Design a protein around this nucleic acid. Structure first.
Lengths: 141, 149, 129
RNA sequence: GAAGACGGUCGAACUUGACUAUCUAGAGGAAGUAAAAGUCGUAACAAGGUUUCCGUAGGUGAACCUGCGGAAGGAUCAUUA
RNA sequence: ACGGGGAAUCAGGGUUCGAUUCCGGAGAGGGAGCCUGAGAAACGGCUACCACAUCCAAGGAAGGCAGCAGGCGCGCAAAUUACCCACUCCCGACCCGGGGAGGUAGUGACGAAAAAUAACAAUACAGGACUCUUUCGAGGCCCUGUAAUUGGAAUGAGUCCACUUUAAAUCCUUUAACGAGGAUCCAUUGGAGGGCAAGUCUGGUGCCAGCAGCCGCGGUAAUUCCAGCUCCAAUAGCGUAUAUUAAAGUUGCUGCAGUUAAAAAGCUCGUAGUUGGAUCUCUCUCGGCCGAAGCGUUUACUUUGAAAAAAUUAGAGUGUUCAAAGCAGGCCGCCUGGAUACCGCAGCUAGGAAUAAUGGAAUAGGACCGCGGUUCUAUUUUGUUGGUUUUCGGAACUGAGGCCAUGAUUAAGAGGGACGGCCGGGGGCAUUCGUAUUGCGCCGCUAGAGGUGAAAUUCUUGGACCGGCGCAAGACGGACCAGAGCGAAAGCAUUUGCCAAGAAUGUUUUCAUUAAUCAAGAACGAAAGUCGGAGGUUCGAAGACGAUCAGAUACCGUCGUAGUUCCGACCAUAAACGAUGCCGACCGGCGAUGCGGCGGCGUUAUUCCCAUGACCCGCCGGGCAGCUUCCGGGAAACCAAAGUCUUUGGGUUCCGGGGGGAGUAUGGUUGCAAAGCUGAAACUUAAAGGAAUUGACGGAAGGGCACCACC
């Protein structure tokens, strides 16, 4: 059992501090290894250059081709595959242009049937993908 | 339970409620003290003195008759051993097992028991040094253990 | 080994009350045990008890009125200030209508209501309800 | 009482010696990870068809096989004067 | 990582954050060294070097925006190269000058407060509303609204006037003139399967495109995609990505868990750490209730009293038009406010003494009394000062004696030790014995034995197997042998002897808290394995053959090497398991069993006087177990512990945090080696897993049945 003594504060504190390193979230957020492995480097968004368009096959239980783009981030030069969310939105993206890419909503985890993809395109050529999708804005000439 | 065994025994003396000298004891306190001195001069420990007084002459408790314990009486007149009797017996047992282990180096149970005995000796010696019964530099050593027995 | 004889006494009383017994034998006795039992008995929870005098450390036979739900010890005996007493009562007592926390204060061993009446904090001994 | 090396002090710098951790380049070798009945070929799950498993040693054309000791999480809570 | 004040939920407790306007510190591209000065190691001062960089007539000269604005760059990420000293203050030789401090500003959705996008009909309607007389019938009495037939009233968004405001000004406020009927003066953002509020309506698409945080939707009748309509959530605001808090009792102090789900170290000693049994209710001065003076044994508490910046927070008052705010506001010149609380811990002060503690007398080396015996003397005198005035508010050498009720709590169903009779496959050393197996030597034959349900290898007129006499080697210790005993665990079984140890029991013995658990360290630690030396029967990894098989070089068989055995030195690992740490209390019953003790009818054995040994019936203590469990607990299986748990705190050690990657990589450390100990991450995944329930299946058992089975 746990120690219950008036002078056990150091033991309890040290045990809690040592046992916190067996928490996945705590170790991830405090070790700093997941931070250097993060392509965004702790940022919420990033800007990259579209290297090519790629279609990744959906995971086994359902069949589809997910329209993604392989982008290279400007801050660190890292290579990134980002999902282009809506339909026809891959046609709004051209090779070798700037795109603003955010996370996929699971904090570095793959989302849904898309395998090994944790980033999504938010803006292309400094205009949002939603404005292009809804026709509120056209691609700059 | 025992300090160095898994046993949990309930064997020990049960002192009676009455702290008075028994009616059958015509021996006054001074005769009891004289017999204690004689038994100590014969070379007996306080435990043996109490056993003999309880067994042969008949003394329920020396403390209830003389008002002092046997070791205190011996120290008062001055007949007590230099080192305490229980520590002396522990050192004697350690010396015995160490002498046995010399010609029985394959006896790995004797080595374990000797470790336990020396742990008991160290604990008792630390307690006695705390209460100034032993000199503050009193140390137990294998090469000097038989010098104390 | 046996430390905190008050914990043993209170656990024995609780276990005997769960079993539905009319008397419990507590040993060893102590001054703190007697004071805790007296505080319990003033509130009608435990009834009369007798201290058996063996010449080493007393035993107590406690009559048991079926009124007691739980008696417990708090270990270690935290020092409790009068401003932290309400938090202790919320943590330990079933309601604000009944149940007592027994503190040991320089004014003696008494319940939390008396300790607030005498404007004393102290060290928490236990509770009963 | 107005410039300048010298019993000296604080001391940025500067080349030369080891060759310093956060950084990068190649055919490599070993391994991990994602759904894919992928050309005679089944270890485990039933006694899984040699009961399984642990430690340790060898050997294998792969699951694996074998020796020694152990466990039942066994397929026996039991076997008779 | 500048620190703090402080900031983000309120259960209580906490977890994160604090570059950032207040306080303190530091720096002015990086270092270093200085002048002046009260104050600088100052940079809107200087001198160098380093890195950048400006003009040059190429001799030289001049640099420091982490000040206000502005550029570039970096980026997901942040404003105008504006006006003014009118306010707040600061500086100066100063009432007067100056201040990108500071104050004031056409595109700041960081965020916070208030708050529009409408309020009122005849009418048909689906209605209902106080006894409705009628399903065919008073329904501006009360309310809702499909509305291509209505109607007036209200008002600010906006545009403008009056300069209120202000240092010229914009803004709010104020007054005027226009300003609303699809009041087109037209609200959006995300959703409509569930979680989660709201359509299995229609069209298109047809596992495509896509949706989907998760589960899932889509493979021509999609409640989920693309759309139309309709519906609902918040609303001038909604969605998304990240960090963070609560949810998370999934870090558990409150308050988790560790038999089987992840998990108690193989075992035992052990230092630090943590925790620790009862017990104690002319001492002192002015006036026959006061300041001083306190070693009461220091403390820890608890309760006070001072000192703890403001702002923030809590909170009192005060109609900002309400509110966020602010510190302010009326009365035919006077009244007020500008509070209070909290401000951890650590320091300072003051009652009573419960409760970790600390225990002042034990070779008495322990108050109070007569002695001053050489000495300091109200800082030696006390008529005109005169050496010498011994003990009455102190200091050493201590020679004597006395009321000290003279001073040692108890003896833990705590522990150590002694003693007694026992007890045990506990350990070491030596010594006996037993068959069996394998060899060997002799004595008697068909020409067979071995081995597997007939699939072989394996000797031979050199006689195998078998039977009988012996002999020799190593190995082992059957039956007795048990849910029996001993040991810390690993483990331990032939006799006898020696050596040391041990539990329990018995004890009116002794010591008297000496204790529990334990980082660091340490001893032991099955088997296998390693290095030396013996030995080498049997079995036997490797290996060699022989075998039904589709394919063994597997299972089976015959051989067989290291090993298996012993003696040294290593190794330190096991499903080292009760998959259950240890110490201590309490909580049911019963029958046994091992050991010790105690009591008792009787039955049996050593000459007929007794114990004692073997039985019998009981009681007590420890131990290995056999138990319902609706005491109780658990998810249950089950457990008298795995109970005494939301009615949650006896003490303490180790240890787990979804599944994989992985006990892997790397570093360290040990080892001759094999390997041991400590031990990640990137990445990947929606489950993996535990208990049990039904079925199905089993080359699983029991019992039956059928010529769509067999015989």
């Amino acid at each position: 059992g746990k120690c219950r003594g008036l002078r056990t504060a150091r033991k309890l504190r040290s045990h809690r501090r040592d046992q916190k390193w067996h928490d996945k979230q705590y170790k991830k957020a405090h070790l700093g290894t997941a931070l250097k492995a993060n392509p965004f480097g702790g940022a919420s968004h990033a800007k990259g250059i579209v290297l090519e368009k790629v279609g990744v096959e959906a995971k086994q239980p359902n069949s589809a081709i997910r329209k993604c783009v392989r982008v290279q981030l400007i801050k660190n030069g890292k290579k990134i595959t980002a999902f282009v969310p809506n339909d026809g939105c891959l046609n709004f993206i051209e090779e070798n242009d700037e795109v603003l890419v955010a996370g996929f909503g699971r904090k570095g985890h793959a989302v849904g049937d898309i395998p090994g993809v944790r980033f999504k395109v938010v803006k292309v050529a400094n205009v949002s993908l939603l404005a292009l999708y809804k026709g509120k804005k056209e691609r700059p000439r | 339970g025992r300090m160095h065994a898994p046993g949990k025994g309930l064997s020990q003396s049960a002192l009676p409620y009455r702290r008075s000298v028994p009616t059958w004891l015509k021996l006054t306190s001074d005769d009891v003290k004289e017999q204690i001195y004689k038994l100590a001069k014969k070379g007996l420990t306080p435990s043996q003195i109490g056993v003999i007084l309880r067994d042969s002459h008949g003394v329920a408790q020396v403390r209830f008759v003389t008002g002092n314990k046997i070791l205190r009486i011996l120290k008062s007149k001055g007949l007590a051993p230099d080192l305490p009797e229980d520590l002396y017996h522990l050192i004697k047992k350690a010396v015995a097992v160490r002498k046995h282990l010399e010609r029985n180096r394959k006896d790995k149970d004797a080595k374990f028991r000797l470790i336990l005995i020396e742990s008991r000796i160290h604990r008792l010696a630390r307690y006695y040094k705390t209460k100034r019964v032993l000199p503050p530099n009193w140390k137990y050593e294998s090469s000097t253990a038989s010098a104390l027995v | 080994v046996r430390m905190n004889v008050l914990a043993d006494a209170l656990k024995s009383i609780n276990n005997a009350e769960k079993r539905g017994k009319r008397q419990v034998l507590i040993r060893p006795c102590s001054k703190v045990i007697v004071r805790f039992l007296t505080v319990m008995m003033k509130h009608g929870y435990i009834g009369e008890f007798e201290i058996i005098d063996d010449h080493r450390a007393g035993k107590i036979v406690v009559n048991l009125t079926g009124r007691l739900n739980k008696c417990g010890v708090i270990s270690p005996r935290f020092d409790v200030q009068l401003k932290d007493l309400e938090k202790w009562q919320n943590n330990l007592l079933p309601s604000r209508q009944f149940g007592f926390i027994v503190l040991t204060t320089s004014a003696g061993i008494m319940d939390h209501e008396e300790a607030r009446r005498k404007h004393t904090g102290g060290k928490i001994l236990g509770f009963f309800f």
